[PDB]
Every structure is written in C-alpha cells, then in structure tokens.
Amino acid sequence: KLGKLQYSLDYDFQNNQLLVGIIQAAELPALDMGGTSDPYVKVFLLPDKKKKFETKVHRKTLNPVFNEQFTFKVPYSELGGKTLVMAVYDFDRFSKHDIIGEFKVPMNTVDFGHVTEEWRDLQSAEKEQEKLGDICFSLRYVPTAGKLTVVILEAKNLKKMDVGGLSDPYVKIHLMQNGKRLKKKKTTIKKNTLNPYYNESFSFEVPFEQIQKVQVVVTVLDYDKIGKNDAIGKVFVGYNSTGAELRHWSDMLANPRRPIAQWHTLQVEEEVDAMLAVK
Amino acid sequence: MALSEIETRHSEIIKLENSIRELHDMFMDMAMLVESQGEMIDRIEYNVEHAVDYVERAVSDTKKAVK
Amino acid sequence: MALSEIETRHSEIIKLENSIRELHDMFMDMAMLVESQGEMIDRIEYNVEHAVDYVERAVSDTKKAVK
Amino acid sequence: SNRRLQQTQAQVDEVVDIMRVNVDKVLERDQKLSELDDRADALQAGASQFETSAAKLKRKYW
Amino acid sequence: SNRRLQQTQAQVDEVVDIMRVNVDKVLERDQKLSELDDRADALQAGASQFETSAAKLKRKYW
Amino acid sequence: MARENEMDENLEQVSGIIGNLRHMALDMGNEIDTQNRQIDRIMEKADSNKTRIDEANQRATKML
Amino acid sequence: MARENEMDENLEQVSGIIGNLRHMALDMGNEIDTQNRQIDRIMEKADSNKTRIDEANQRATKML
Amino acid sequence: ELEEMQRRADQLADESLESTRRMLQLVEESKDAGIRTLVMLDEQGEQLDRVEEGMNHINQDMKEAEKNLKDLG
Amino acid sequence: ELEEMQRRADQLADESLESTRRMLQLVEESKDAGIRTLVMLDEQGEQLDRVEEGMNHINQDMKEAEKNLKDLG
Ligand SMILES: [Mg+2]
Numbered sequence: 001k002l003g004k005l006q007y008s009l010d011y012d013f014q015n016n017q018l019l020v021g022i023i024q025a026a027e028l029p030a031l032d033m034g035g036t037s038d039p040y041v042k043v044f045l046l047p048d049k050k051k052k053f054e055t056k057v058h059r060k061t062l063n064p065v066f067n068e069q070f071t072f073k074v075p076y077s078e079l080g081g082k083t084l085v086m087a088v089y090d091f092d093r094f095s096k097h098d099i100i101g102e103f104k105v106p107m108n109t110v111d112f113g114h115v116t117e118e119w120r121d122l123q124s125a126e127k128e129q130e131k132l133g134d135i136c137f138s139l140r141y142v143p144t145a146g147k148l149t150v151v152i153l154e155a156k157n158l159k160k161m162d163v164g165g166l167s168d169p170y171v172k173i174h175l176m177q178n179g180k181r182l183k184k185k186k187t188t189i190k191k192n193t194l195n196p197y198y199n200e201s202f203s204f205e206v207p208f209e210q211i212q213k214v215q216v217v218v219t220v221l222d223y224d225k226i227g228k229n230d231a232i233g234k235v236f237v238g239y240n241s242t243g244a245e246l247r248h249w250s251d252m253l254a255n256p257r258r259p260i261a262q263w264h265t266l267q268v269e270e271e272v273d274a275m276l277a278v279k
Numbered sequence: 280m281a282l283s284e285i286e287t288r289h290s291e292i293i294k295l296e297n298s299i300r301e302l303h304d305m306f307m308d309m310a311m312l313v314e315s316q317g318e319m320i321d322r323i324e325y326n327v328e329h330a331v332d333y334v335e336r337a338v339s340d341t342k343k344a345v346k
Numbered sequence: 347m348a349l350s351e352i353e354t355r356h357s358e359i360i361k362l363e364n365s366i367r368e369l370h371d372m373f374m375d376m377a378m379l380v381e382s383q384g385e386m387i388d389r390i391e392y393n394v395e396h397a398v399d400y401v402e403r404a405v406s407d408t409k410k411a412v413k
Numbered sequence: 414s415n416r417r418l419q420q421t422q423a424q425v426d427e428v429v430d431i432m433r434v435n436v437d438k439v440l441e442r443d444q445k446l447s448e449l450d451d452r453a454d455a456l457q458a459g460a461s462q463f464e465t466s467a468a469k470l471k472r473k474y475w
Numbered sequence: 476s477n478r479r480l481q482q483t484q485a486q487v488d489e490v491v492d493i494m495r496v497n498v499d500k501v502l503e504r505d506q507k508l509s510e511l512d513d514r515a516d517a518l519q520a521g522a523s524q525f526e527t528s529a530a531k532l533k534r535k536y537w
Numbered sequence: 538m539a540r541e542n543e544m545d546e547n548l549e550q551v552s553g554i555i556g557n558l559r560h561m562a563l564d565m566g567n568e569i570d571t572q573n574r575q576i577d578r579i580m581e582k583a584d585s586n587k588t589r590i591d592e593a594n595q596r597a598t599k600m601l
Numbered sequence: 602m603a604r605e606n607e608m609d610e611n612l613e614q615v616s617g618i619i620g621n622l623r624h625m626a627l628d629m630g631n632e633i634d635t636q637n638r639q640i641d642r643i644m645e646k647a648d649s650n651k652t653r654i655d656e657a658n659q660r661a662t663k664m665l
Numbered sequence: 666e667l668e669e670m671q672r673r674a675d676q677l678a679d680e681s682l683e684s685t686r687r688m689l690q691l692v693e694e695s696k697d698a699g700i701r702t703l704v705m706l707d708e709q710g711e712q713l714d715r716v717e718e719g720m721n722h723i724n725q726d727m728k729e730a731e732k733n734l735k736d737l738g
Numbered sequence: 739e740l741e742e743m744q745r746r747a748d749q750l751a752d753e754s755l756e757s758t759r760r761m762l763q764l765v766e767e768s769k770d771a772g773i774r775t776l777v778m779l780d781e782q783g784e785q786l787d788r789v790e791e792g793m794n795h796i797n798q799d800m801k802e803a804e805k806n807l808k809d810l811g
C-alpha cells in the first residue's frame with residue numbers, strides 16, 4: 001500500500017560485476033509532518049549483508065527519483081544463488097529511521113542477456129519464533145501401578161549457546177504441582193552436538209487420583225563448567241497445557257500400558273513459567 | 280592432486296554411500312520384523328488372558344466343589 | 347559375567363584371528379608377486395643393456411661412415 | 414583429508430556388523446515368539462476344557 | 476575390556492583394506508612389467524638389426 | 538573449495554549421525570537379547586502350566 | 602585372572618605389531634604407486650626409441 | 666582434452682556432493698526407523714511382562730486347583 | 739552341569755589364549771614378509787632407475803645416429 005518501485009538490473013560479463021540501478025519510487029505513504037516523507041533506499045546483496053549501498057536522502061517527496069547506480073563485484077557462478085534486497089527507508093533527524101518497505105529478488109528467476117528494468121510493488125518488512133529447536137520424547141502411564149515413564153529420546157535444531165560453535169545440551173526434567181517443583185532429574189551431557197541423542201528413561205510415582213493435576217516440565221539447557229548454566233528451551237505437558245502437548249498427554253492417557261513418542265517445540269522459559277504459575 | 284586423486288575420492292565416497300544404504304535397509308527390515316512380532320505378541324497376550332480367565336473360573340468351581 | 351560373555355569374547359577373538367590370518371596371507375602373496383616381478387625386471391634390464399650395446403656400436407659405425 | 418573419509422567408513426562398517434547380528438537375533442526372537450504363540454493357543458484350549466470339567470465337577474460334588 | 480578387542484579388530488580391518496588395494500596395484504605392476512619385457516625384447520632385436528645394417532653402411536661409405 | 542567444504546560438513550554430520558546409530562544399535566541389540574532370555578523363561582513357565590493343566594484335567598475328568 | 606591378563610598382554614603386542622604393519626603397508630603401497638608411474642614413463646620412452654630405431658633402420662637399409 | 670578434464674573434475678565434485686546429501690537423507694531415515702524400533706521394543710517389552718505375570722497367576726491358581734483335587738480324592 | 743560349565747569356561751579361556759598366541763606368530767610372519775617385500779622394492783627400484791638411464795642413453799645415441807644419417811643423405 002506504500003507504493004511501487006522502479007529499478008534496473010543487468011550483468012556486465014566483461015568486468016564480471018552486477019549492475020543494479022535504482023531508478024525511482026512512486027505512491028509512497030507519508031509518515032512525516034508536511035504530508036510527505038523523506039525517503040532513501042538501501043540496497044545490498046541478499047545472500048550476505050556486507051557492503052550495503054545507500055542512496056542520497058530526498059527531502060519531502062512521495063515520488064522520489066534517485067536515478068543512481070551500484071556495482072556488486074560478484075562472479076557469474078556465485079551470482080545464481082545470490083539474491084538482491086532493496087528496502088525503502090524514511091529519514092528522521094531525531095529518531096530511528098523507520099523502514100517504509102522492502103523487496104527481494106532471487107537471481108535464479110532473473111534472466112540476464114537483455115537489460116532488465118521493472119516496477120515492483122513494495123511490501124512490509126518481516127519483524128517467527130527465535131528458538132526453532134525441537135525435543136522428542138515418549139510418555140507411558142499405567143494407571144494401576146501409577147508409574148510414569150518419561151523417556152528422553154532426542155533433540156534437534158537447537159539454538160547455538162557457545163561462541164563460534166555448537167552447543168553442549170542436557171535435559172533437565174521437573175515435576176510440578178501447584179507451582180512447586182517436586183522431583184528433579186537430568187540426563188548425560190552430550191558435548192558439541194547439533195542434534196543430541198540420549199535415549200534415557202525416567203520414572204515417577206504418580207497416583208491415578210492426581211493424574212489430572214500434575215505438570216511435567218522438560219527443559220533443554222546448555223552446559224558450561226564456569227558460572228551459571230543457561231537454558232535453551234522448555235516445554236510442559238499435563239495440567240493447564242495446550243497445543244500438541246495436551247494432545248500427547250491425552251494420547252498417553254488413552255493408551256495405557258503403552259509408550260507414545262512425540263516431538264515438541266521449545267518455548268521461552270518466561271511464558272512457560274508464567275503458565276505454570278497459574279492456578 | 281590430479282584426476283587420479285579425485286577419482287579415488289569419488290570411488291571411496293560411492294563405497295561409503297552403498298555401505299550407508301545397506302545400513303539403512305537393515306534398519307528398515309529391523310523395524311518391520313519388530314512390528315510383525317509385535318502383532319504376534321498381541322495375539323499371544325490375548326490367548327494368555329483368555330486362559331487366565333478360564334483357569335480362574337475353573338479354580339473357583341473346584342474350590343466350591345471340594346468343600 | 348556369564349557363559350554368554352565368555353562365548354562372545356571367544357567368538358570375537360576367533361574373528362580377530364581369522365582377519366589376522368587373511369592379512370598374513372595377503373602379505374605372503376605380496377612378497378611372492380614382488381619377487382616374481384623382480385625376476386621379470388632382471389630379464390628386462392638384461393635385454394635393455396644388450397640393446398644399449400648394439401645401439402652404441404651401430405652409432406659408432408655410422409658416425410665413422412658419414413665422415 | 415582421506416583420514417575422515419576412511420574413519421567414517423570404518424564407523425559405518427562397524428555399525429553394519431552390529432546391525433546384522435541384531436537382525437539375526439531378531440529372527441531368533443521371531444521363532445521363539447511363534448512357538449510361544451502355538452503353545453499359548455494350546456494352553457488356553459486346555460484351560461477351557463479344564464474349566465468345563467471343573468463346572469461339571471462343581472455341579473457334581475456340591 | 477571389549478574396547479581394546481574391537482579397536483584392535485578395527486586396526487586389522489583397516490590394514491586389510493590397505494593391503495588388498497596394494498595387492499591389486501601390484502598386479503597392475505605385473506602387467507606393466509610384462510608388457511615392458513616384451514617391448515624390451517623387441518627393442519633389442521631391432522637394435523641388433525640396426526647394428527648389422529650400420530656395419531654394412533660403415534663398410535660401404537668409408 | 539566451497540564445493541569441497543560443503544561436502545566436508547556433510548561428511549561430519551554423517552559421522553555424528555553414524556555414531557548415534559551405533560549407540561542405538563547397541564541398546565537395541567542388548568535389549569533384544571534380554572527380551573529373548575525373558576521369552577525363554579516364558580516358554581518354560583508356559584510348558585510347565587501346560588503339563589499342569591493337562592494332568593489336572595485328566596485327574597478331574599477321572600472322578601466323573 | 603592370570604589367564605586373562607596373559608592374553609591381554611598378547612593382544613597389546615598384537616595391537617602394536619598391527620600398527621607397525623599399517624605403517625609398512627602405507628609405505629609399501631605409496632612406493633608401489635610411484636614405481637608404477639616410473640614404469641609408465643619407461644614404456645613411453647621405450648616405445649619412442651622403438652619407433653626411432655625402426656625408422657632409422659629403414660632409412661639406413663634404404664641407402665643400401 | 667583439457668577443458669573436458671576440468672569439467673570432468675568439477676563433475677566428480679558435484680557428484681560426490683549430491684552423494685553425501687543422499688547419505689545424510691539415508692542416515693536420517695535410518696535414525697527415525699531406529700527410534701520407532703526402540704519404541705516398539707519398549708511396548709512389546711511391557712506386554713511380555715504382563716504375559717509373565719499372567720503365567721505366574723496361572724501357576725498359582727493351578728497349584729491351588731491341584732490342592733483341591735488332592736483334597737477331594 | 740555345573741562342573742562341566744566351569745570346565746567349559748576355563749576351556750574357552752585357554753582356547754582364546756592359544757588363539758592370541760597364534761595371532762602373535764601370524765603377525766610376526768606378516769612382519770618379516772613385509773620387511774623383505776620392502777627390501778625387494780628398493781632393489782627393483784634401483785634396477786628400474788638403471789633401466790631409465792639406459793633408455794635415456796639409447797635416446798641420445800639414436801638422436802646422434804639420426805643426425806649422421808641426415809648428414810649422409
Ligand atoms: Mg523525517
């Protein structure tokens with residue numbers, strides 16, 4: 001809704017360099033006082049954000065004309081897997097320069113040979129979950145003996161916690177009720193692994209009369225010897241649980257004398273602990 | 280290096296891929312057999328529980344018969 | 347432990363002995379082939395030296411012939 | 414670095430040597446389970462027969 | 476300690492994998508040497524013939 | 538070298554996964570063994586009870 | 602345990618000897634390769650001189 | 666000869682690369698198959714335990730039945 | 739059953755022991771075979787070098803002979 005952007009694109013095979021020309025922009029939304037914004041466009045290679053190029057700042061126009069040119073000294077072989085980013089910014093002298101729009105162009109969709117030049121509609125820049133890690137385990141409950149068998153199987157795509165390398169993950173299991181942490185368990189520490197494999201079983205004494213009032217808290221943490229050990233992620237199943245967690249719980253209940261294995265997405269400890277302080 | 284080094288590299292790599300593939304197939308067969316045997320255990324436990332019921336009722340009857 | 351542990355120990359040990367034996371036989375064959383090829387090289391060098399003599403005398407003769 | 418290639422290869426070979434043995438042991442498990450199945454069927458059959466006889470005997474000596 | 480047994484086993488397997496390749500390369504060497512032998516025999520034959528012709532030519536142009 | 542390194546990373550991941558596969562294969566095999574021993578026990582007891590119930594049934598029908 | 606240890610020592614010696622065998626196999630194979638390259642060179646030169654001497658003999662007998 | 670040689674080398678490089686990718690996929694499938702295998706082993710294990718308890722119960726019951734039949738004879 | 743079992747265990751122990759002794763002997767034979775193999779490789783190597791020098795000499799001589807025949811024609 002902000003407006004459109006006219007740009008030019010072509011590749012010079014004689015010098016082996018990419019020629020990106022910023023022609024102009026149109027129908028940009030106004031964010032400043034006078035009824036017009038102060039726009040300027042930042043252009044850089046999408047693959048690696050290095051050596052970003054910025055145009056000159058135009059004062060108070062919703063149809064700025066830059067007619068500028070930038071050169072990216074990039075070979076033609078590497079070019080194919082490289083994208084272009086053209087983002088329109090609004091200049092403000094006394095605050096952060098808000099982004100008006102952005103546009104990304106894949107270099108595998110681009111056809112070189114003829115000089116390309118087109119108008120493309122601007123879109124709103126992206127601000128998803130940060131962790132992007134997952135933990136898989138199995139739940140088994142037999143109501144008669146009141147035994148809860150939680151087998152930590154394996155985690156994957158965990159967030160980096162160490163400097164310039166992989167993480168040193170270990171699983172801590174808490175059993176909570178009415179906000180209190182009863183039992184404490186943990187696993188072996190697998191060092192330098194992107195996907196830790198444990199296959200470690202834990203058992204808990206849970207009566208059939210309190211099965212609907214128990215909380216199972218699985219936490220994946222990082223291990224450094226020195227100082228406090230931080231936390232990568234955590235999820236909880238049982239009382240006051242929602243999503244695939246409550247589903248897995250209900251599968252454990254519906255299937256007695258049988259263990260059901262499932263994956264779970266790691267949430268931040270703040271929200272989870274905020275949920276556990278409920279009731 | 281040369282083409283010989285690259286060729287031997289490629290060869291040993293393919294060898295690795297084939298060994299890996301055999302490992303894979305072994306795991307697949309593993310899961311399969313374990314599953315079928317699982318069904319077998321299902322029917323075993325069935326027959327056993329039925330047997331338990333029959334035995335229990337029989338024992339009750341004889342126990343009431345002797346006295 | 348038990349008899350199972352001792353039996354598996356014994357089995358893996360025998361396996362090791364057989365692998366060792368294959369290694370041995372490979373070394374023996376190695377020495378053999380290298381030796382025979384050695385004799386082959388003997389006769390090669392023989393023929394070559396004879397060829398050298400013949401060539402040398404021929405060259406001397408032509409060299410005296412041209413002038 | 415051929416060292417890593419050959420080392421990984423050795424790992425794979427080892428795991429293979431583990432897995433084939435595991436598979437054979439699984440087959441043995443299949444045999445044992447099958448025989449146990451037959452034995453269990455016969456067992457429950459005899460159980461039902463004995464239950465019937467027990468019913469007769471209870472209806473006789475009481 | 477099964478670790479040492481299996482480790483030694485892995486060593487043996489590795490050395491085997493080296494040695495079989497070495498042996499094949501040796502066989503190739505046997506081929507090359509054989510062909511070189513034939514080539515050398517032909518070479519010295521031609522050498523003797525050329526020596527004779529050279530003798531004739533020396534006894535002609537001098 | 539990017540081609541080569543990319544491949545290198547792949548081989549490293551394959552190495553790790555292979556190690557995990559090793560551990561899993563060990564646990565698998567071991568538990569398979571123990572379960573086999575248990576099955577042996579089960580068949581022993583089952584044959585025992587089979588004999589028990591056959592003899593008992595014969596003795597029971599004997600008094601009829 | 603003496604039976605077991607004695608055997609242990611044996612396995613250690615076998616380990617060392619196996620390592621040495623590895624080194625020897627490496628040197629062996631490498632030198633075999635280099636010698637194979639050299640043999641290739643030898644056959645190239647030998648064929649060259651074979652052609653040389655055949656042509657030269659023909660030219661020599663030509664003037665007779 | 667030379668151009669075809671360089672192209673051959675790069676070719677072998679690509680082939681080996683995609684091969685390693687295939688390996689990663691295969692060991693992933695292997696991984697998951699192994700996991701579910703272990704799960705099955707746990708389930709069937711507990712089932713075997715229940716079978717054992719069944720056998721024990723049968724044994725004790727038939728022991729009692731034997732007692733009653735010996736008390737009747 | 740028990741006596742035969744203990745005797746069986748000790749038996750397996752002895753068997754494994756003498757087996758390892760056999761291994762030591764075998765890797766010794768392998769060792770020596772390897773050594774003499776390397777020796778042969780050195781000898782034959784020097785022989786190959788002499789062969790190469792022979793070939794070079796032949797080449798130069800035939801080059802000269804070619805020169806004389808071209809000077810005669
Ligand atoms: Mg402003």
Ligand SMILES: [Mg+2]
Binds near residue numbers: 161162168222223
């Ligand atoms: Mg760390």
